[PDB]
């Protein structure tokens, strides 16, 4: 008996979004930071 | 009967086959997080790891035996499930 | 169940051997309840020569002794060594069975090999039982899957922690704690531990539970293996060792109390190393301990386990869980300083609960009060917790002097 291969609780769009927002929030470019900061400030689905 | 815990089965001889408010439990109010403050210190496949669904979701609390004689439900022998999500296991 | 007779169609066949062309069905019923009545009277009188002459076989000389008894003429030719042969004839619509008798030349019976001469009846004496059992003389009856290496390692390590000796147990626990490759045998150990803690309900063995808790404590100290995938099995086993009520076989003398604080220290370690905000291990452990403690009707053993785990979690937990219900100490001292039944088992558990409570609430009182503490004990419940707090302040001063 093998338990089923589980899936991460984030989608790959959500995981890609997390990667883009974190790589923008380390501030290589300032306009990228500022949008990523506004995206953090008003994304409704940023829970989970 | 013959799987892991066979020793226990053979020894037994069985042969078939307001303080409960949610905030109290938030870990800001239950953790000495002051110790963490550092003073003078000196994606096609998942990027993050996948957590134990049974620990994260299951009610393992239902396997706690509160009273041995007055046990609310009847427990059953558990079969080995060999989860393959865990690495370090060949299969 | 019913009266069984020969079939009525077996008498139409017999009546045509006679020459009777048409025989009506009421005559055939009249024939077959008589001939099956006379069969049952020679079946049961042959059985009286099988029983009185002790044979249990019903040879054909029993029926011939019963036909002689009913005056009917004997049946000639049934003592020779024969059997039951029948030969099927298909035919063009007439289905039957016959004998197919055979012939033999007469000079091949005059010149047959003769059988051997019989022996005469003689007697033989032998002992069947000699004041007891039978003698043994010949006149009596005679009377994914673990490889073998790690299967052997699993067998030796699990049987070393069952209690034959202490030194093999210490070397087995020092093996579990300090080996690099014990993965692929972690699910077997988790199953063994959880089922063994479950088997405490059939046999309330304190010693084997202490051995399983030292097995868990050895599994936690292994740097190489990660217990994150198997912690959902080890958490309720240690919880069962904490908050169950009968941990003992003899409740009064067995120190279930230590398997309580040992497993409480164990669960504080298991929710220090593994609690993540996705897990919610510590919040879900505090909630079980809290609703087991605040709820009345709980025995003093399970309240002791709840207070022990909550007080091993840390200082802020005993600030926000233990300290609101300090008035419960009065409900405890209701049954300690003044009990109608003194010789029951509630008193030792109650003053164990009291000693644990004031030992753990003495540094909490030392943290959130004045340095004087003149009549804090009087302000405290029962005036004892306050004496313990004064002792704790003295101990803290001694520690500062040592520093």
Curated annotation (Swiss-Prot), chain A:
<comment type="similarity">
    <text>Belongs to the TAF6 family.</text>
</comment>
<feature type="modified residue" description="Phosphotyrosine">
    <location>
        <position position="47"/>
    </location>
</feature>
<comment type="function">
    <text>The TFIID basal transcription factor complex plays a major role in the initiation of RNA polymerase II (Pol II)-dependent transcription. TFIID recognizes and binds promoters with or without a TATA box via its subunit TBP, a TATA-box-binding protein, and promotes assembly of the pre-initiation complex (PIC). The TFIID complex consists of TBP and TBP-associated factors (TAFs), including TAF1, TAF2, TAF3, TAF4, TAF5, TAF6, TAF7, TAF8, TAF9, TAF10, TAF11, TAF12 and TAF13. The TFIID complex structure can be divided into 3 modules TFIID-A, TFIID-B, and TFIID-C.</text>
</comment>
<feature type="modified residue" description="Phosphothreonine">
    <location>
        <position position="42"/>
    </location>
</feature>
<comment type="subunit">
    <text>Component of the TFIID basal transcription factor complex, composed of TATA-box-binding protein TBP, and a number of TBP-associated factors (TAFs), including TAF1, TAF2, TAF3, TAF4, TAF5, TAF6, TAF7, TAF8, TAF9, TAF10, TAF11, TAF12 and TAF13. Interacts directly with TBP, TAF1/TAFII250, TAF9/TAFII31 and TAF12/TAFII20. The TAF6/TAFII70-TAF9/TAFII31 heterodimer forms an octamer complex with the TAF4B/TFII105-TAF12/TFIID20 heterodimer.</text>
</comment>
<protein>
    <recommendedName>
        <fullName>Transcription initiation factor TFIID subunit 6</fullName>
    </recommendedName>
</protein>
Swiss-Prot record, chain B:
<comment type="function">
    <text>The TFIID basal transcription factor complex plays a major role in the initiation of RNA polymerase II (Pol II)-dependent transcription. TFIID recognizes and binds promoters with or without a TATA box via its subunit TBP, a TATA-box-binding protein, and promotes assembly of the pre-initiation complex (PIC). The TFIID complex consists of TBP and TBP-associated factors (TAFs), including TAF1, TAF2, TAF3, TAF4, TAF5, TAF6, TAF7, TAF8, TAF9, TAF10, TAF11, TAF12 and TAF13. TAF1 is the largest component and core scaffold of the TFIID complex, involved in nucleating complex assembly.</text>
</comment>
<protein>
    <recommendedName>
        <fullName>Transcription initiation factor TFIID subunit 1</fullName>
    </recommendedName>
</protein>
<comment type="subunit">
    <text>Component of the TFIID basal transcription factor complex, composed of TATA-box-binding protein TBP, and a number of TBP-associated factors (TAFs), including TAF1, TAF2, TAF3, TAF4, TAF5, TAF6, TAF7, TAF8, TAF9, TAF10, TAF11, TAF12 and TAF13. Interacts with TAF7; the interaction is direct. TAF1, when part of the TFIID complex, interacts with C-terminus of TP53.</text>
</comment>
<comment type="similarity">
    <text>Belongs to the TAF1 family.</text>
</comment>
<comment type="subunit">
    <text>(Microbial infection) Interacts with SV40 Large T antigen.</text>
</comment>
């Amino acid at each position: 008996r093998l338990k089923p291969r589980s899936i991460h609780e984030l989608s790959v769009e959500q995981q890609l979004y997390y990667k883009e927002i974190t790589e923008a929030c380390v501030g290589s470019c300032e306009a990228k930071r500022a949008e990523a900061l506004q995206s953090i400030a008003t994304d409704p689905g940023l829970y989970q | 009967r013959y799987g892991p815990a066979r020793l226990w089965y053979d020894m037994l001889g069985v042969p078939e086959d307001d303080l409960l408010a949610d905030e109290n439990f938030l870990m800001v109010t239950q953790l000495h997080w002051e110790d963490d403050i550092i003073w003078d210190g000196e994606p096609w496949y998942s990027i993050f790891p996948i957590d134990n669904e049974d620990l994260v979701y299951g009610r393992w609390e239902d396997n706690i035996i509160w009273d041995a004689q007055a046990m609310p439900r009847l427990l059953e022998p558990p079969v080995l499930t060999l989860d393959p999500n865990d690495e370090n296991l060949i299969l | 169940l019913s009266n069984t007779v020969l079939p009525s169609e077996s008498m139409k066949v017999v009546a045509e051997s006679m020459g009777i062309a048409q025989i009506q069905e009421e005559t055939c019923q009249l024939l077959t309840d008589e001939v099956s009545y006379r069969i049952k009277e020679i079946a049961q009188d042959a059985l009286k020569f099988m029983h009185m002459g002790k044979r249990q076989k019903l040879t054909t000389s029993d029926i011939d002794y019963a036909l002689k008894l009913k005056n009917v003429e004997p049946l000639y030719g049934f003592h020779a060594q024969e059997f039951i042969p029948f030969r099927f004839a298909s035919g063009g619509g007439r289905e039957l069975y016959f004998y197919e008798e055979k012939e033999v030349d007469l000079s091949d019976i005059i010149n047959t090999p003769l059988p051997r001469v019989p022996l005469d009846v003689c007697l033989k004496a032998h002992w069947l039982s000699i004041e007891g059992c039978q003698p043994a003389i010949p006149e009596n009856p005679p009377p994914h899957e673990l490889s073998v290496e790690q299967q052997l390692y699993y067998k030796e390590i699990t049987e070393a922690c069952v209690g034959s000796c202490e030194a093999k147990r210490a070397e087995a626990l020092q093996s579990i704690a300090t080996d690099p490759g014990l993965y692929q045998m972690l699910p077997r150990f988790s199953t063994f531990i959880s089922e063994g803690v479950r088997v405490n309900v059939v046999q309330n063995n304190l010693a084997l539970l202490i051995y399983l808790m030292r097995m868990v404590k050895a599994l936690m100290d292994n740097p190489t293996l990660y217990l994150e995938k198997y912690v959902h099995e080890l958490i309720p086993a240690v919880m069962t060792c904490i908050v169950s009520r009968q941990l003992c076989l003899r409740p009064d003398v067995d120190n279930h109390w230590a398997l309580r604080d040992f497993a409480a220290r164990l669960v504080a370690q298991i929710c220090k190393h593994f609690s993540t905000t996705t897990n919610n291990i510590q919040s879900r452990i505090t909630k079980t301990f809290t609703k087991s403690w605040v709820d009345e009707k709980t025995p003093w053993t399970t309240r002791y386990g709840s207070i022990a785990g909550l007080a091993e979690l840390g200082h802020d937990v005993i600030k926000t869980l233990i300290l609101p219900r300090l008035q419960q100490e009065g409900e405890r001292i209701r049954s300690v300083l003044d009990g109608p039944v003194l010789s029951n088992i509630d008193r030792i558990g109650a003053d164990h609960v009291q000693s644990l409570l004031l030992k753990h609430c003495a540094p909490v009182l030392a943290k959130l009060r004045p340095p004087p503490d003149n009549q804090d004990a009087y302000r405290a419940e029962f005036g004892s917790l306050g004496p313990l707090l004064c002792s704790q302040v003295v101990k803290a001063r001694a520690q500062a002097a040592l520093q």
